[PDB]
Design an enzyme around this catalytic site. Structure first.
Site, PDB file in Angstrom:
ATOM      1  N   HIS A 129      -9.469  -3.114  -2.564  1.00 38.94           N
ATOM      2  CA  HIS A 129      -8.453  -2.429  -1.763  1.00 38.94           C
ATOM      3  C   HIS A 129      -8.807  -0.960  -1.588  1.00 38.94           C
ATOM      4  O   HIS A 129      -8.729  -0.425  -0.473  1.00 38.94           O
ATOM      5  CB  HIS A 129      -7.067  -2.628  -2.404  1.00 38.94           C
ATOM      6  CG  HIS A 129      -5.927  -1.930  -1.711  1.00 38.94           C
ATOM      7  ND1 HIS A 129      -4.873  -2.611  -1.127  1.00 38.94           N
ATOM      8  CD2 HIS A 129      -5.642  -0.613  -1.580  1.00 38.94           C
ATOM      9  CE1 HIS A 129      -4.005  -1.735  -0.639  1.00 38.94           C
ATOM     10  NE2 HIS A 129      -4.442  -0.517  -0.910  1.00 38.94           N
ATOM     11  N   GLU A 130      -9.229  -0.291  -2.665  1.00 39.98           N
ATOM     12  CA  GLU A 130      -9.530   1.136  -2.547  1.00 39.98           C
ATOM     13  C   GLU A 130     -10.808   1.375  -1.750  1.00 39.98           C
ATOM     14  O   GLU A 130     -10.896   2.345  -0.983  1.00 39.98           O
ATOM     15  CB  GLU A 130      -9.625   1.800  -3.921  1.00 39.98           C
ATOM     16  CG  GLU A 130      -8.468   1.570  -4.854  1.00 39.98           C
ATOM     17  CD  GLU A 130      -7.113   1.779  -4.215  1.00 39.98           C
ATOM     18  OE1 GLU A 130      -6.996   2.594  -3.266  1.00 39.98           O
ATOM     19  OE2 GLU A 130      -6.153   1.123  -4.671  1.00 39.98           O
ATOM     20  N   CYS A 135       0.842  -1.187   0.000  1.00 41.90           N
ATOM     21  CA  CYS A 135       0.000   0.000   0.000  1.00 41.90           C
ATOM     22  C   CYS A 135       0.881   1.241   0.000  1.00 41.90           C
ATOM     23  O   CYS A 135       1.918   1.277   0.668  1.00 41.90           O
ATOM     24  CB  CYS A 135      -0.901  -0.035   1.235  1.00 41.90           C
ATOM     25  SG  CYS A 135      -2.075   1.361   1.438  1.00 41.90           S
ATOM     26  N   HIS A 179     -10.065   1.450   1.803  1.00 43.14           N
ATOM     27  CA  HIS A 179      -9.520   2.721   2.290  1.00 43.14           C
ATOM     28  C   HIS A 179     -10.630   3.693   2.675  1.00 43.14           C
ATOM     29  O   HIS A 179     -10.500   4.434   3.657  1.00 43.14           O
ATOM     30  CB  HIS A 179      -8.617   3.374   1.241  1.00 43.14           C
ATOM     31  CG  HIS A 179      -7.201   2.889   1.259  1.00 43.14           C
ATOM     32  ND1 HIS A 179      -6.416   2.900   2.395  1.00 43.14           N
ATOM     33  CD2 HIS A 179      -6.421   2.397   0.267  1.00 43.14           C
ATOM     34  CE1 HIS A 179      -5.220   2.419   2.104  1.00 43.14           C
ATOM     35  NE2 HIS A 179      -5.191   2.118   0.817  1.00 43.14           N
TER      36      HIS A 179
HETATM   37  O1  LIG Z   1      -4.565   2.291  -2.205  1.00 39.64           O
HETATM   38  C1  LIG Z   1      -3.787   2.076  -3.108  1.00 39.64           C
HETATM   39  N1  LIG Z   1      -2.525   1.683  -2.938  1.00 39.64           N
HETATM   40  O2  LIG Z   1      -2.061   1.520  -1.646  1.00 39.64           O
HETATM   41  C2  LIG Z   1      -1.560   1.336  -3.945  1.00 39.64           C
HETATM   42  C3  LIG Z   1      -1.441  -0.173  -4.180  1.00 39.64           C
HETATM   43  C4  LIG Z   1      -2.751  -0.811  -4.669  1.00 39.64           C
HETATM   44  C5  LIG Z   1      -2.689  -2.285  -5.077  1.00 39.64           C
HETATM   45  C6  LIG Z   1      -1.892  -3.156  -4.111  1.00 39.64           C
HETATM   46  C7  LIG Z   1      -2.410  -4.564  -4.338  1.00 39.64           C
HETATM   47  C8  LIG Z   1      -3.839  -4.426  -4.760  1.00 39.64           C
HETATM   48  C9  LIG Z   1      -4.071  -2.949  -5.102  1.00 39.64           C
HETATM   49  C10 LIG Z   1      -0.373  -0.334  -5.246  1.00 39.64           C
HETATM   50  O3  LIG Z   1      -0.602  -0.021  -6.393  1.00 39.64           O
HETATM   51  N2  LIG Z   1       0.825  -0.828  -4.886  1.00 39.64           N
HETATM   52  N3  LIG Z   1       1.083  -1.157  -3.533  1.00 39.64           N
HETATM   53  C11 LIG Z   1       2.190  -0.339  -3.018  1.00 39.64           C
HETATM   54  C12 LIG Z   1       3.412  -0.383  -3.899  1.00 39.64           C
HETATM   55  C13 LIG Z   1       3.191  -1.300  -5.123  1.00 39.64           C
HETATM   56  C14 LIG Z   1       1.913  -0.937  -5.868  1.00 39.64           C
HETATM   57  C15 LIG Z   1       1.616  -1.851  -7.031  1.00 39.64           C
HETATM   58  O4  LIG Z   1       0.963  -2.880  -6.889  1.00 39.64           O
HETATM   59  N4  LIG Z   1       2.122  -1.407  -8.203  1.00 39.64           N
HETATM   60  C16 LIG Z   1       2.012  -1.972  -9.478  1.00 39.64           C
HETATM   61  C17 LIG Z   1       1.552  -3.266  -9.718  1.00 39.64           C
HETATM   62  C18 LIG Z   1       1.483  -3.693 -11.032  1.00 39.64           C
HETATM   63  C19 LIG Z   1       1.851  -2.842 -12.053  1.00 39.64           C
HETATM   64  C20 LIG Z   1       2.281  -1.578 -11.718  1.00 39.64           C
HETATM   65  N5  LIG Z   1       2.361  -1.130 -10.458  1.00 39.64           N
HETATM   66 NI    NI Z   2      -3.594   1.328  -0.335  1.00 38.42          NI
END
Ligand SMILES: O=CN(O)C[C@@H](CC1CCCC1)C(=O)N1NCCC[C@H]1C(=O)Nc1ccccn1
Ligand code: NI
Length: 196
Positions: free
Chosen positions: A167-168, A124, A171
């Site tokens: 996930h969103e 996250c 939040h």
């Molecule tokens: O509330 C929203 N958040 O906390 C951001 C989260 C949301 C996802 C996490 C898993 C399900 C939803 C997020 O995107 N991540 N988690 C933090 C760092 C990594 C990043 C990620 O998965 N990146 C990514 C993946 C594939 C392709 C490109 N980028």
């Molecule tokens: Ni998140």
């Protein structure tokens, strides 16, 4: 306020706008928006999507110091409103994005009996550490939401898209991903749990 600061024409959202664990806004239930939306509420959603697009461009991400992300919720910007943006890339793909949406007052109106979890766990943008384990969610969801014009949409999600949107939505309800990891065995696989 955060919303006034972020919705200026010149503002680019970056990691300094994203609050982290400890800030109580992440544990508060966000307020529904009313319609019609204010200009600031519309701009906010657009700025959130622009952040996601910047974060997925490796050059821009490096320049802005961004962690690449696939979703963002307004409480992560210290804005306690039920607004989310999701930008799930396709895995050479015919289209760039599996799902691109700015959602106002999103709500799960139906869900599968089957559960699902990403095999690699979750992270996250508000959590500056790794917490291992299967984050147990619904496999499939039907989501109602309103767009920036006030039109109502009803969509069905599965796979990665389903995970990201849940996930969103968590939040905006004050829930963090680790709340859904099994405290006794973080990698337990129960009957009916689909590991993606
Ligand atoms: O509330 C929203 N958040 O906390 C951001 C989260 C949301 C996802 C996490 C898993 C399900 C939803 C997020 O995107 N991540 N988690 C933090 C760092 C990594 C990043 C990620 O998965 N990146 C990514 C993946 C594939 C392709 C490109 N980028
Ligand atoms: Ni998140």
């Amino acid at each position: 306020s955060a919303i006034e600061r972020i919705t200026k024409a010149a503002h680019l959202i970056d990691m300094n706008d994203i609050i982290r664990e400890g800030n109580p806004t992440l544990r508060t239930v966000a307020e529904e928006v009313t319609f019609p939306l204010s200009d600031q509420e519309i701009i906010l959603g657009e700025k959130m999507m622009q952040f996601l697009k910047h974060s997925q461009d490796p050059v821009m991400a490096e320049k802005m110091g961004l962690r690449g992300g696939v979703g963002l919720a307004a409480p992560q910007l210290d804005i306690s409103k039920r607004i989310i943006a999701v930008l799930v890339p396709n895995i050479t793909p015919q289209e760039a994005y599996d799902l691109e949406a700015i959602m106002y007052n999103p709500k799960i109106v139906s869900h599968s009996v089957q559960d699902a979890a990403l095999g690699e766990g979750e992270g996250c943008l508000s959590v500056d550490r790794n917490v291992p384990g299967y984050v147990v969610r619904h496999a499939r969801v039907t989501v109602d939401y309103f767009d920036k014009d006030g039109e109502k949409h009803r969509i069905k999600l599965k796979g990665y898209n389903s995970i990201v949107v849940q996930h969103e939505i968590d939040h905006i309800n004050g829930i963090m991903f680790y709340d859904r990891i099994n405290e006794k065995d973080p990698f337990a696989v129960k009957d009916g749990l689909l590991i993606l």
